[PDB]
Amino acid sequence: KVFGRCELAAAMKRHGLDNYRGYSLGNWVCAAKFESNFNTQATNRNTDGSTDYGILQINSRWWCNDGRTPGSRNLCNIPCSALLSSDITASVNCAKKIVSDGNGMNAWVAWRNRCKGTDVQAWIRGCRL
Ligand SMILES: [Cl-]
Ligand code: NA
């Protein structure tokens, strides 16, 4: 599923991401835009052989099991394919674990490079929340 901007913002807000660990909604929407272009089916392979999955590009090196990343962990306790669902619940619940791990949203490279320190409220502007 390819989300619209405001559609995703409302889904995220409903799933408890607004101000989660102090990150306003615009941060999460911005991250999703640059990580996946709002496509829940996005996958991207890393150099180390791990793979990023879904709207928030969650890495199989640490967070999910894809059966093909030897010596990895499964900290979110889910198959990585669950992160590609049109239902964002699993991605959001795993994101909450990631963002609480000490390093905040800096875990997401695109957020650090493209959202951090910008006017992220522009990402929810006009939306019916
Ligand atoms: Cl933080
Ligand atoms: Na694993």
Is 35 an annotated catalytic residue?
A: yes
Whole-number Å distance between alpha carbons of 28 and 111:
8
Q: Tokens for 111, please give them.
A: 């957020």
Specify binding-site residues for substrate: 101
The structural domain count of the chain equals: 1
Question: Which method, experimentally, gave rise to this model?
Answer: X-ray
Distance (Å) from CA 68 to ligand 1 centroid: 31
Distance (Å) from CA 61 to ligand 2 centroid: 7
Q: How do the residues of the chain divide into helix, strand and coil, expressed in percent and rounded to 5?
A: 40, 10, 50
> What CATH code is carried by the domain that includes residue 25?
1.10.530.10
Q: Are 91 and 55 in contact (CB under 8 A)?
A: yes
Cα 18 to Cα 22, 25, 126: the distances in Å are: 8, 5, 16
Give the residue numbers spanning the domain of 87: 1-129
Is 52 an annotated catalytic residue?
A: yes
This PDB structure is determined at a resolution in Å of 1.9
Point out the catalytic residue in the list 52, 66, 87, 119: 52
